[PDB]
Amino acid sequence: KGCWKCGKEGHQMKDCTE
Ligand SMILES: [Zn+2]
């Protein structure tokens, strides 16, 4: 499990403004 936007496994998909 991780981010469904960029994929980086660390932050979820709420603070993915990077
Ligand atoms: Zn992300």
UniProtKB/Swiss-Prot annotation:
Free-text description of this protein's post-translational modifications in UniProt: Methylated by host PRMT6, impairing its function by reducing RNA annealing and the initiation of reverse transcription.
Highest taxon of the lineage: Viruses
Location(s) in or outside the cell: Virion
Signal peptide residues on this chain, from the entry's feature table: none
Regions annotated as coiled coil: none
Zinc finger (CCHC-type): 1-18
Role description: Encapsulates and protects viral dimeric unspliced genomic RNA (gRNA). Binds these RNAs through its zinc fingers. Acts as a nucleic acid chaperone which is involved in rearangement of nucleic acid secondary structure during gRNA retrotranscription. Also facilitates template switch leading to recombination. As part of the polyprotein, participates in gRNA dimerization, packaging, tRNA incorporation and virion assembly.
The protein's name in its UniProt record: Nucleocapsid protein p7
Protein's organism: Human immunodeficiency virus type 1 group M subtype A (isolate U455) (HIV-1)
Source lineage: Viruses, Riboviria, Pararnavirae, Artverviricota, Revtraviricetes
Gene: gag-pol
Span covered, complete protein: 405 to 422 of 1428
